[PDB]
């Protein structure tokens, strides 16, 4: 809250999850999946006691998914469905969530980098015409991550549910020519896990079963460390088989899949994506920077996003980077490798770094009038008010 | 997206 | 859309079925042919189809003259053909 | 000299046996095995131990359906072998009785569906390499051989190496996009809904309505009703109305023979004329897990392949397998696909601003002269080339590495 | 009767032909395609790697890799394949019967020429060979002996000032900024509209969009306002699968990186300042002739509006009394090859070859003494 | 390249 009583809300609006709260807070006040469901009848499910409205949104639309057809309003960071997104935002600022009068509040929104501009333009238009907010700012995600960590230099590897992006920043100066954006994240990993499980005889073909497979990938799956050793474990031993109880009651068994579904981040060719993994992409991003910044970029690799919470992802990333550095910088001199100093900063609450950075930035800039895009500027200019941020649109 | 990829 | 037929029946014995059905007017026991000739003919015809699909597609080698041709319309208002030639420099410091 | 390689396409409802180099399979038998089964107690691995030489008292193929005192078992379900004892006995009579091949002088080309688990391939390699001792094996995906069976019925100069193969057999329906001769494996689709699900649906329809069908033939009838009076409808409710208002024309009669007293029974074939094949464009009729029509699955398959190979894939959609021999199946498939494609193209044009009108994507569904055995002939091509003997797993490779030599197939990476 | 072969082998496009012709015999992209699927239709023409045009016609299922990046051959196994396809499949001539005149960019590592010679003498077994600077052949072909050549190929852009035939090697400038960087920058700026091209087989579609639609604006800060005010500058393109894209502003922002490399995150000056500095590095006497004989060459200079903008720049940069004339013929897409064919056919050149006997006497280290 | 730029 600023000196005018106008609450300063911070809303992350992720492809796979909304994390909303107030400025200066230390934890997101509400974290709920971003999906909108509509009631349907199914010949295999029977419920007759829980009141199901004609439109469930967010948390209740996920816990009650057995009796709904759910769909995400976002995808790859690009809003595919605008009506469902407006419903999700009505629910976010509604009574059974953050309860605010949007006529007298400021909001801090985010957006991935290298995203179509019509998306941000329409989001600002919606925020100024539908909810009629008194102030809107659209910050960069890596900048917010470096705000939350408390740094001014580092290469943010932000891998959310919808999209992975690597953004380096040096001494506070953004290098926008090194921003890389790989389109593999939690959702593609979930789809790959669905494929692998279908190889075992389980069929998850409905809209609700996607959340079941998501909750499986979150509990069981993990990123391997020495993929040859993990394959030897999966092919020779039987210590990787683990059982999971679906909501209906069925018991499925997940084995080698545990380390094959999240491997599609380091070996994209498994899911028919022609490129390089997140480790090789990080190394190429670094080695594309000037010589005088590489040595500091190697020491401040900041992980963020939920999809980097796989057990053993920091260590595997570090091992991959060390191998790449040994082969392609030292050209094979093992003696010098012990001098190479990486530091993959994986904070414990790295699943909400963007929100914490937004909270810090809003707590800093709540009481200014040259930072926020004011509603009057919108009514006067239109979608040109975005030029305040540094993104030039006419 | 509009061209390339879905979103 | 398209209309259906009520009185269509393709009665066939299970043994007749294993080879084909009267829903496809050619299916069944076919005349034995040479397989290697068919394979090589299909290979050559796919090669010939690829050649013409390349020829009728966008060509990067289109502006190098000869059979490829010259990408004209790329000359400008302030452009002077290499056919033109200036004379060596002669400044007053070069005479007497 | 060399002897021709043996080709054995083992499908859920029918197995095609032959020697590579011919034009059509030498044998097409039912994939069933008649063994002596009695009332016993205990596990299945324990009551299968036959004393003496009684484990060779079994029959396969056509000779296993005639036997009325034997129990007929089907080892393959949904294209995936669920029983390996019966499958080994089936293979040994396939090799030593029908093909009459000495399994140590002939390379073998077996087949598989896309989602065959690697342990099935390892067990097949163990069987063919240690029990039958073949000098080489090659387990090719079933639909990818079905593409090279449409070239015998199409005019010269338009026999392409690019197309989307739709193989609908007795137990599984899979869609495989081939481009320039390279199987795009990461886009293959696989649905366990196929001919036998149609036969179960049709018998359940007949049993709820008709009377006079002997129980021991209630399946054998639902096949003769399905593969004779079945067609495809352009609309479902309109067809129900057409049958209700003018039943005297759309309702047919089927007359069969009760093969115990040789009397004749007669039944009325009504809605199950068009409700059978409709589980292709409404898979929820037979398996409530899947809810996606076949046109939409084909469209997703083609829309996931690389961009510049999407337009030829739409032009050569080759049907294969028996379950696609339904009247006007390809027509309805092409109609739905053309609807989807034209709608997408018009949306892209509208979003572009309305300056260019792109080329309408040609959609064609190819029915050919070889569909019933389109897979096998494909194999008979691949197993007749010299390069075949360079892609097989030699006996040395197995003796050195083990069955794990056969663990990889073009559906998964690494 | 033996006639030399003129084989360019620059980045992006390889152009080969016989010495004494007016146009290259065979032009094809210098790519090598590795199949990234495992196809089981064996015997239908399967291969392990498709070279040149055969890769483009299959680029849907291939990973295309350029063996030459920024003028430097980063993969020699692939370059040997490119040269073998040029010799035995495009030209259809044995290499052991003709001398070969290759071209190279200035200021490349000496290992490049060393390995070029070693390969041309130990693998293809040619009787003689030579290696020429491209911007010198681009002046040979123009019918001149005095001028500054501004050669902008697919992967590298270099300027060479020559006067009366005496090159000034202390003023040769190089700039690693060319078609391949403009194509990777268009791939980035296209995302603002919503179009996402990422595959190496879609970099070709983006390169086609760039070489068919993009142009160089005479005034960037004015054409931006023009494209902002009205939709009278948009153009539509039809992808090879049906989808249609439209690009109005990207058209001149793509080649504008040539004149403001900061768009790509590069400190270096634009191509106009690269040419102007290379002129002002010479002597005060020959600058007037270098000004009025500014030659252009290479594909990247095949942009509608490149000559007008280059003149407007180098005129606002040169003294007010110097006349600037941008020599830009429409046949400049292949001026380097014409210069090579002119040079290889001359009689006074027949002593400048590097003979197989010479290579047998001093190894690959000879190409540094003979070749300028 | 080896140092500076990739090639
Ligand atoms: N512990 C975990 N391990 C692996 N994957 C996870 C984990 N937690 C979340 N995910 C995946 O990442 C997504 C959540 O990440 P998040 O950063 O909240 O995405 P968003 O970009 O929507 O904010 C989920 O959809 C899930 O698929
Ligand atoms: N003409 C036909 N019309 C409809 N269904 C058919 C026809 N012929 C065969 N079928 C069905 O297809 C299955 C057999 O076809 P097939 O391709 O041999 O499958 P598989 O190879 O998996 O055994 C059987 O279930 C049969 O009922
Ligand atoms: N007409 C054109 N308009 C714009 N750019 C072009 C044109 N022709 C070629 N280019 C660019 O220049 C490159 C081709 O130049 P080229 O002369 O083939 O290089 P090289 O001679 O080194 O092979 C391509 O990468 C392309 O991006
Ligand atoms: Mg996020
Ligand atoms: Mg089959
Ligand atoms: Mg050039």
UniProtKB/Swiss-Prot annotation, chain A:
Role this protein plays: ATP-binding component of the Arp2/3 complex, a multiprotein complex that mediates actin polymerization upon stimulation by nucleation-promoting factor (NPF). The Arp2/3 complex mediates the formation of branched actin networks in the cytoplasm, providing the force for cell motility. Seems to contact the pointed end of the daughter actin filament. In podocytes, required for the formation of lamellipodia downstream of AVIL and PLCE1 regulation.
InterPro entries: Actin, Actin/actin-like_CS, ATPase_NBD
Residue positions, PTM N-acetylmethionine: 1
Keyword terms: Acetylation, Actin-binding, ATP-binding, Cell projection, Cytoplasm, Cytoskeleton, Nucleotide-binding, Nucleus
CDD domains: ASKHA_NBD_Arp2
Annotated GO MF terms: actin binding; ATP binding; structural constituent of cytoskeleton
Location in the cell: Cytoplasm, Cytoskeleton; Cell projection; Nucleus
Protein name per UniProt: Actin-related protein 2
Residues annotated with N6-acetyllysine modification: 299, 322
Organism of derivation: Homo sapiens
Keyword Nucleus listed: yes
Quaternary assembly: Component of the Arp2/3 complex composed of ACTR2/ARP2, ACTR3/ARP3, ARPC1B/p41-ARC, ARPC2/p34-ARC, ARPC3/p21-ARC, ARPC4/p20-ARC and ARPC5/p16-ARC. Interacts with AVIL.
GO cellular component terms, A-Z: actin cap; actin cytoskeleton; Arp2/3 protein complex; azurophil granule lumen; cell cortex; cell projection; cytoplasm; cytosol
Family: Belongs to the actin family. ARP2 subfamily.
Cross-referenced SMART domains: ACTIN (SM00268)
Gene3D superfamilies linked: 3.30.420.40, Actin, Chain A, domain 4
UniProtKB/Swiss-Prot annotation, chain C:
N6-acetyllysine modification, residue list: 67, 87
Cortactin repeat extents: 60-96
Sequence positions bearing Phosphoserine: 93
Cysteine-cysteine disulfides: none
Record's compositionally biased regions (Acidic residues): 1-8
Tissues where this protein is expressed: Expressed at intercalated disks in the heart (at protein level). Expressed in most tissues, except in B-lymphocytes or plasma cells.
Subcellular location: Cytoplasm, Cytoskeleton; Cell projection, Lamellipodium; Cell projection, Ruffle; Cell projection, Dendrite
PTM text: Acetylated.
Entry remark concerning the domains of this protein: The SH3 motif may mediate binding to the cytoskeleton.
The protein's assembly and partners: Part of a complex composed of NEDD9, AURKA and CTTN; within the complex NEDD9 acts as a scaffold protein and is required for complex formation. Interacts (via N-terminus) with NEDD9. Identified in a complex containing FGFR4, NCAM1, CDH2, PLCG1, FRS2, SRC, SHC1, GAP43 and CTTN. Forms a complex with ABL1 and MYLK. Interacts with SHANK2 and SHANK3 (via its SH3 domain). Interacts with PLXDC2 and SRCIN1. Interacts with SAMSN1 (via SH3 domain). Interacts (via SH3 domain) with ASAP1 (via Pro-rich region). Interacts (via SH3 domain) with DNM2. Interacts with ACTN1. Interacts with FER.
Name assigned to this protein: Src substrate cortactin
Organism listed in the record: Mus musculus (Mouse)
Lineage: Eukaryota, Metazoa, Chordata, Craniata, Vertebrata
Gene: Cttn
Residues of the full protein shown: 21 to 116 of 546
Swiss-Prot record, chain D:
Coiled coil: none
Compartments reported by the entry: Cytoplasm, Cytoskeleton; Cell projection; Nucleus
Alphabetized GO MF terms: actin binding; ATP binding; structural constituent of cytoskeleton
Residues found modified as N6-acetyllysine: 238, 242, 249, 252
Main subcellular localisation: cytoplasm
Any one of the GO BP annotations: asymmetric cell division
Pfam families, alphabetized: Actin
Membrane-crossing segments per the record: none
Source organism superkingdom: Eukaryota
InterPro entries assigned to the protein according to its UniProt record, in alphabetical order: Actin, Actin/actin-like_CS, ATPase_NBD
Keywords, alphabetical: Acetylation, Actin-binding, ATP-binding, Cell projection, Cilium biogenesis/degradation, Cytoplasm, Cytoskeleton, Nucleotide-binding, Nucleus
One GO term describing the cellular component: nucleus
Stated family: Belongs to the actin family. ARP3 subfamily.
Assembly notes: Component of the Arp2/3 complex composed of ACTR2/ARP2, ACTR3/ARP3, ARPC1B/p41-ARC, ARPC2/p34-ARC, ARPC3/p21-ARC, ARPC4/p20-ARC and ARPC5/p16-ARC. Interacts with WHDC1. Interacts weakly with MEFV. Interacts with AVIL.
Function: ATP-binding component of the Arp2/3 complex, a multiprotein complex that mediates actin polymerization upon stimulation by nucleation-promoting factor (NPF). The Arp2/3 complex mediates the formation of branched actin networks in the cytoplasm, providing the force for cell motility. Seems to contact the pointed end of the daughter actin filament. In podocytes, required for the formation of lamellipodia downstream of AVIL and PLCE1 regulation.
Protein name from the UniProt record: Actin-related protein 3
Organism for this UniProt entry: Homo sapiens (Human)
UniProt lineage: Eukaryota, Metazoa, Chordata, Craniata, Vertebrata
Gene: ACTR3
From Swiss-Prot, chain E:
Matching Pfam families: Actin
Molecular function as annotated in GO: ATP binding; ATP hydrolysis activity; identical protein binding; kinesin binding; nitric-oxide synthase binding; nitric-oxide synthase regulator activity; protein kinase binding; structural constituent of postsynaptic actin cytoskeleton
Catalytic activity: ATP + H2O = ADP + phosphate + H(+)
Keywords: Acetylation, ATP-binding, Cytoplasm, Cytoskeleton, Hydrolase, Methylation, Nucleotide-binding, Nucleus, Oxidation, Ubl conjugation
Highest rank taxon of the organism: Eukaryota
Modified residues (Tele-methylhistidine): 70
Post-translational modification: ISGylated. Oxidation of Met-41 and Met-44 by MICALs (MICAL1, MICAL2 or MICAL3) to form methionine sulfoxide promotes actin filament depolymerization. MICAL1 and MICAL2 produce the (R)-S-oxide form. The (R)-S-oxide form is reverted by MSRB1 and MSRB2, which promote actin repolymerization.
Residue positions where Methionine (R)-sulfoxide is found in the record: 41, 44
Primary localization: cytoplasm
GO biological process, one term: cellular response to cytochalasin B
Cellular compartments per GO CC: actin cytoskeleton; actin filament; adherens junction; apical junction complex; axon; brush border; calyx of Held; cortical cytoskeleton
Enzyme Commission number(s): 3.6.4.-
InterPro entries recorded: Actin, Actin/actin-like_CS, Actin_CS, ATPase_NBD
N6-methyllysine PTM sites in chain numbering: 81
Similarity comment: Belongs to the actin family.
Protein name: Actin, cytoplasmic 1
């Amino acid at each position: 809250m600023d000196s005018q009583g106008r609450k300063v809300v911070v809303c992350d609006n992720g492809t796979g999850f909304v994390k909303c709260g107030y400025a200066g807070s230390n934890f997101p006040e509400h974290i709920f999946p971003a999906l909108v469901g509509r009631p349907i009848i199914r010949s295999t499910t029977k419920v007759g006691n829980i009141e199901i409205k004609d439109l469930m949104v967010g948390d209740e639309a996920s816990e009650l998914r057995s009796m709904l057809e759910v769909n995400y309003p976002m995808e790859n960071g690009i809003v595919r469905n605008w009506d469902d997104m407006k419903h999700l935002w009505d629910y976010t600022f509604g009574p059974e969530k953050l309860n605010i009068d949007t006529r007298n509040c400021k909001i801090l929104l985010t957006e991935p980098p290298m995203n179509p501009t019509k998306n941000r333009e329409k989001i600002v238009e919606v925020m100024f015409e539908t909810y009629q907010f008194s102030g809107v700012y659209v910050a960069i995600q890596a900048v917010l991550t470096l705000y939350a960590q408390g740094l001014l230099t580092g290469v943010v590897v932000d891998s959310g549910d919808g999209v992975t992006h690597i953004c380096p920043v040096y001494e506070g100066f953004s290098l926008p020519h090194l921003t890389r954006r790989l389109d593999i994240a939690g959702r593609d990993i979930t789809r790959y896990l669905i494929k692998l499980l279908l190889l075992r005889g389980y069929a998850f073909n409905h809209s609700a079963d996607f959340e079941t497979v998501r909750m499986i990938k979150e509990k069981l799956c993990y990123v391997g460390y020495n993929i040859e050793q993990e394959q030897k474990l999966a092919l020779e031993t039987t210590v990787l088989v683990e059982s999971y109880t679906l909501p209906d009651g069925r018991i499925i068994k997940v084995g080698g899949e545990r380390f094959e579904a999240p491997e599609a981040l380091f070996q994209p060719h498994l899911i028919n994506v022609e490129g390089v993994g997140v480790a090789e992409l990080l190394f190429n991003t670094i080695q594309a920077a000037d010589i005088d910044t590489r040595s500091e970029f190697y020491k401040h690799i900041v992980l963020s996003g939920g999809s980097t919470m796989y057990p053993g992802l920091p260590s595997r990333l570090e091992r991959e980077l060390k191998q790449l550095y040994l082969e392609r910088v030292l050209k094979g001199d093992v003696e010098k490798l012990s001098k190479f100093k990486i530091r993959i900063e994986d904070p414990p609450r790295r699943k909400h770094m963007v929100f914490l950075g937004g909270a810090v930035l809003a707590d800093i800039m709540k009481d200014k009038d040259n930072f926020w895009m004011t509603r009057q500027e919108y009514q006067e200019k239109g979608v040109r008010v975005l030029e305040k941020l540094g993104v030039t649109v006419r | 997206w509009x061209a390339x990829c879905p979103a | 859309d398209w209309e259906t037929d009520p009185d269509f029946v393709n009665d066939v014995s299970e043994k007749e079925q294993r080879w084909g059905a009267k829903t496809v007017q050619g299916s069944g026991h076919q005349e034995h042919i040479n397989i290697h000739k068919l394979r090589e003919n299909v290979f050559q015809e796919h090669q010939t189809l690829k050649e013409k699909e390349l020829e009728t597609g966008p060509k990067a080698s289109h502006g190098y003259g000869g059979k490829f041709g010259v990408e004209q319309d790329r000359m400008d208002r302030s452009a002077v053909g290499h056919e033109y030639q200036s004379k060596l420099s002669k400044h007053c410091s070069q005479v007497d | 000299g060399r002897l021709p390689a043996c080709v054995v396409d083992c499908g859920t409802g029918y197995t095609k046996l032959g020697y590579a180099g011919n034009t059509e399979p030498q044998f097409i038998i039912p994939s069933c095995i008649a063994i002596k089964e009695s009332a016993k107690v205990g596990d299945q691995a324990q009551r299968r131990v036959m004393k003496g030489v009684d484990d060779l008292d079994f029959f396969i193929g056509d000779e296993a359906i005639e036997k009325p005192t034997y129990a007929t078992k089907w080892p393959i379900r949904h294209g995936i072998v669920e029983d390996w004892d019966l499958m080994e006995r089936f293979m040994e009579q396939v090799i030593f009785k029908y093909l009459r091949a000495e399994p140590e002088d002939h390379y073998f080309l077996l087949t598989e569906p896309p989602l065959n688990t690697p342990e099935n391939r390892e067990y097949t390699a163990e069987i063919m390499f240690e029990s039958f001792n073949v000098p080489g094996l090659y387990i090719a995906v079933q639909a990818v051989l079905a593409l090279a069976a449409s070239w015998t019925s199409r005019q010269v100069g338009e026999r392409t190496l690019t197309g989307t193969v739709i193989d609908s057999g007795d137990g599984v329906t899979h869609v495989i996009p081939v481009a320039e001769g390279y199987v795009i494996g990461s886009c293959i689709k696989h649905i366990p809904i196929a001919g036998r699900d149609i036969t179960y649906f049709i018998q359940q329809l007949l049993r709820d309505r008709e009377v006079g069908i002997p129980p021991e033939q209630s399946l054998e009838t639902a096949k003769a009703v399905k593969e004779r009076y079945s067609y495809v409808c352009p609309d479902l409710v309109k067809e129900f109305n057409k049958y209700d208002t003018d039943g005297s024309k759309w309702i047919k009669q089927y007359t069969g023979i009760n093969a115990i007293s040789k009397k004749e029974f007669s039944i009325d074939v009504g809605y199950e004329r068009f409700l059978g094949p409709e589980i292709f464009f409404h898979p929820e009729f037979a398996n409530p897990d899947f809810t996606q029509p076949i046109s939409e699955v084909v469209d997703e398959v083609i829309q996931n392949c690389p961009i510049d190979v999407r337009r030829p894939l739409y032009k050569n959609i080759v049907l294969s397998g028996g379950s696609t021999m339904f009247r006007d199946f390809g027509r309805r498939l092409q109609r739905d696909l053309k609807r989807t494609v034209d709608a997408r193209l018009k949306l892209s044009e509208e979003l572009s601003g309305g300056r260019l009108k792109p080329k309408p994507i040609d959609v064609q569904v190819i029915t050919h002269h070889m569909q019933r055995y389109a897979v096998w002939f494909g194999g008979s091509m691949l197993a007749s080339t010299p390069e075949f003997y360079q892609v097989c797993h030699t006996k040395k490779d197995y003796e050195e590495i083990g069955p794990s030599i056969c663990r990889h197939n073009p559906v998964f990476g690494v | 009767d033996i006639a030399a072969l003129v084989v360019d082998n620059g980045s992006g496009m390889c152009k080969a032909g016989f010495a004494g012709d007016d146009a290259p015999r065979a032009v094809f992209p210098s790519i090598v395609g590795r199949p990234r699927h495992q196809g089981v239709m064996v015997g239908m023409g399967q291969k392990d790697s498709y070279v040149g045009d055969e890769a483009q016609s299959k680029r849907g299922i291939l990973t295309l890799k350029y063996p030459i990046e920024h003028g430097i051959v980063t993969n020699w196994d692939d370059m040997e394949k490119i040269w073998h396809h040029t010799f035995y499949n495009e030209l259809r001539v044995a290499p052991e019967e003709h001398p070969v005149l290759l071209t190279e960019a200035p200021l490349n590592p000496k290992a490049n020429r060393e390995k070029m010679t070693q390969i041309m003498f130990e693998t293809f077994n040619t009787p003689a060979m030579y290696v020429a600077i491209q911007a010198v052949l681009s002046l040979y072909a123009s019918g001149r002996t005095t001028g500054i050549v501004m050669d902008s190929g697919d992967g590298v852009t270099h300027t060479v000032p020559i006067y009366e035939g005496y090159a000034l090697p202390h003023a040769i400038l190089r700039l690693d900024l060319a078609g391949r960087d403009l194509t990777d920058y268009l791939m980035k700026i296209l995302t603002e509209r919503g179009y996402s091209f990422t595959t190496t087989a879609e970099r070709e579609i983006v390169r086609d969009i760039k070489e068919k639609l993009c142009y160089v604006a005479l005034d960037f800060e004015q054409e931006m306002a023009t494209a902002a005010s009205s939709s009278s500058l948009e153009k539509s393109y039809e992808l090879p699968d049906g989808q249609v894209i439209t690009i109005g502003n990207e058209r001149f922002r793509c080649p504008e990186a040539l004149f403001q490399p900061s768009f790509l995150g590069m400190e270096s000056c634009g191509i106009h300042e690269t040419t102007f500095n290379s002129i002002m590095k010479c002597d005060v006497d020959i600058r007037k002739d270098l000004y009025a004989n500014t030659v252009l060459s290479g594909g990247t200079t095949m942009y509608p509006g490149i000559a007008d903008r280059m003149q407007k720049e180098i005129t606002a940069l040169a003294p007010s009394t110097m006349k600037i004339k941008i020599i830009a013929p429409p046949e400049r897409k292949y001026s380097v090859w014409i210069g090579g064919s002119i040079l290889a056919s001359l009689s006074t050149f027949q002593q400048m070859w590097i003979s197989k006997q010479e290579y047998d006497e001093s190894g690959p280290s000879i190409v540094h003494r003979k070749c300028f």
